[PDB]
Amino acid sequence: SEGIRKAKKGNYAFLWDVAVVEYAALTDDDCSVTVIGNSISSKGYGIALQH
């Protein structure tokens, strides 16, 4: 939440999930941001369960 406006106001590139940044681009009332892609497909994300 601080990284919303501090990246808006201040040259701060952030370290986070891209899909969140996709939605943060989806929320800003002006198209006023920039993202750069990432491709690391050897490691994945699964969903935990009962052992």
If one asks whether residue 44 binds a copy of itself (CB under 8 A), the answer comes out as yes
d(CA 18, CA 20) in angstroms, rounded, equals: 5
Contacting residue, 15, 40, 47, 49, with a copy of itself by CB under 8 A? 40
d(CA 49, CA 46) in angstroms, rounded, equals: 10
Q: In the structure encoding, which two tokens stand for residue 50, read together?
A: 């009962």
If one asks whether residue 47 binds a copy of itself (CB under 8 A), the answer comes out as no
If one asks whether residue 39 binds a copy of itself (CB under 8 A), the answer comes out as yes
Question: At 21, which helix (H) or strand (E)?
Answer: helix 18-25
Q: How far is the CB of 5 from a copy of itself (least distance, A)?
A: 30
If one asks whether residue 45 binds a copy of itself (CB under 8 A), the answer comes out as no
